[PDB]
Amino acid sequence: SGFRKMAFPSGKVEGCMVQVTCGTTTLNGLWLDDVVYCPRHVICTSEDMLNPNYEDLLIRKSNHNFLVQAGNVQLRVIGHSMQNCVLKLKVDTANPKTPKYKFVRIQPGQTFSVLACYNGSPSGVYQCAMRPNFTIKGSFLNGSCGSVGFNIDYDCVSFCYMHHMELPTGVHAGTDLEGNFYGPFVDRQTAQAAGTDTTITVNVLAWLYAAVINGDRWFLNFTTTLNDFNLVAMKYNYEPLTQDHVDILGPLSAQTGIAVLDMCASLKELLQNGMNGRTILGSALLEDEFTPFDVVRQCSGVT
Amino acid sequence: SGFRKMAFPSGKVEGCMVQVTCGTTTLNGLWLDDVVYCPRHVICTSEDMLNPNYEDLLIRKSNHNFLVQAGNVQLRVIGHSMQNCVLKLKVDTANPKTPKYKFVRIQPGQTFSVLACYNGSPSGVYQCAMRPNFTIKGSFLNGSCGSVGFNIDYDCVSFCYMHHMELPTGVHAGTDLEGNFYGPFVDRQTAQAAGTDTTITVNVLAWLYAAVINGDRWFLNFTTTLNDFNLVAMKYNYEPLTQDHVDILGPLSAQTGIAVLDMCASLKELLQNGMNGRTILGSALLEDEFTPFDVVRQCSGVT
Numbered sequence A, B: 001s002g003f004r005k006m007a008f009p010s011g012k013v014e015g016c017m018v019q020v021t022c023g024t025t026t027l028n029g030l031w032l033d034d035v036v037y038c039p040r041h042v043i044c045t046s047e048d049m050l051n052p053n054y055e056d057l058l059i060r061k062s063n064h065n066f067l068v069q070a071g072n073v074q075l076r077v078i079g080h081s082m083q084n085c086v087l088k089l090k091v092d093t094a095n096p097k098t099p100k101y102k103f104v105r106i107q108p109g110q111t112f113s114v115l116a117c118y119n120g121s122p123s124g125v126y127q128c129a130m131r132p133n134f135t136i137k138g139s140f141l142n143g144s145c146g147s148v149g150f151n152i153d154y155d156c157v158s159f160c161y162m163h164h165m166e167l168p169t170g171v172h173a174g175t176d177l178e179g180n181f182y183g184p185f186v187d188r189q190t191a192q193a194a195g196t197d198t199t200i201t202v203n204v205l206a207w208l209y210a211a212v213i214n215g216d217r218w219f220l221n222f223t224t225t226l227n228d229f230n231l232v233a234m235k236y237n238y239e240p241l242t243q244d245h246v247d248i249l250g251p252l253s254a255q256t257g258i259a260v261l262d263m264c265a266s267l268k269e270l271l272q273n274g275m276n277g278r279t280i281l282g283s284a285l286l287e288d289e290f291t292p293f294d295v296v297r298q299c300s301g302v303t
């Protein structure tokens, strides 16, 4: 038993991290097959990042201006093209360590693992959630640009995130692997407002089920309507709970023998009454970085 | 910026996880060079685990009674020997993916990453701390026995943990890679008391420095004696703060420009006054699973 914030095994993603150098700027890249994916603002200097014209800047760049290092190995760049906010550098060598992989774009609330890298070398791995306002509260330093987020679906790595930028708030923004930003953000150093962040309600409910499974049960009690609890959730800046959310919580409801609405009733008084100084699974706040599938992955131990 | 509980890259450890089967029992093992390390209670049935005589039980076992699977590959066992609580199975093949590695025994308070495995296949990775009473609050299911904890010191994997058992509390106990249990625990299913757990004080102080580095500073204020704050710590079941602990907090003190004693004064009122409903780095409790080296690893981004 026990419940921890668990990240996927990062082995298959480690073998795809490269070092990309252009001009003086250096950030991380993703080498799959004979293509290297990296953020496009590698072609920018510090004066460029205030308002870069990426088409005009890339036009001054040629294949030999791109230094792709794969460990001690250095790959020959034979092509380049800008797809949205990522650069796609075609190289002569295909990556021998390429896993079976897909490119996916997650929806808000979904979770993934981040392999934080610097100069193409891995440094750490952690689990996090795509906030409703399409940001992530990550751990990123200067040079972590190019690190990727991913999920693993039985020997298949689903890349969903490439880190681009830090917002002045201290939170982070990025794109999918096709270059399209999550949220209303642009790769440019100006004031950028992240929206009002809400709590992933379906995740908090899945996390309370994981606590019942693990023995902590004091928060159980009432029932409530979906409509009635949503009005409770709206006041506490929780994102509304739809019927599909109830449907996905079905297996947890059947294993626990607690109807979804009864759990929503127990959470509604958690919201209105605080926690009185107690803890759930060793946390004094309500955790929302576990999806209903995350909870049953860990409680079932899928590999 | 940002601060997350970060686990080491688990790639090098993934290539050493095997499946070990003996009788009907199956758990994980560690294949380094031509030796496979696993918990010795793999030779036990469910009636054996009440009070097993491991010498008498192992004497009935021969090399062919041991099924070591390395993925689809299955290795030939040509020797076996019991070192304390681990079994050492010599195999014909040397592991081609063996990293540069050491066997170390950590002291309490030190942290490491756990690669949770089932049937020799990795499932997740998380960061945790060896509690002062030599247990870990982990995430382990039936079959996770044999998973290892480790630190990585620049391309060198230092194995320090092998998970053996769940205590009736729901916490976990294990050994070093030489078979000696952390704590007063024996591989046998009886009532086993873990000692009074204390809070790793040197870790909480390193975590408050990481918050100052990351912008959250409201908890700063006074100074206090080492002796005077230790008496504050003793009442709140914090382990005493020695001078070496102050010495290790030096670099964080010089980067932050806050003397260690002033931080101890700020923590002492955190202990006496609670947190008033606020959060530090997004946590409503005082985190103690970050060592002073963990904090500067992440704030420096070592790879």
Ligand SMILES: C[C@H]1CN(C(=O)Nc2cncc3ccccc23)Cc2ccccc2O1
Pocket (backbone or CB within 6 Å): A041, A049, A140, A141, A142, A143, A144, A145, A164, A165, A166, A167, A168, A188, A189, A190, B001
């Ligand atoms: C300069 C250009 C390129 N960017 C980065 O280098 N971003 C960073 C990514 N990760 C961690 C960081 C920590 C500290 C400073 C930047 C970090 C993204 C960016 C972030 C903030 C302001 C402007 C900006 O645009």
Ligand SMILES: C[C@H]1CN(C(=O)Nc2cncc3ccccc23)Cc2ccccc2O1
Pocket (backbone or CB within 6 Å): A001, B041, B049, B140, B141, B142, B143, B144, B145, B164, B165, B166, B167, B168, B188, B189, B190
């Ligand atoms: C039976 C023998 C072998 N052991 C395990 O199989 N331990 C386990 C390790 N991890 C997760 C577990 C989750 C649920 C049940 C056991 C778990 C260790 C052990 C634990 C508890 C009681 C007795 C005992 O001794």
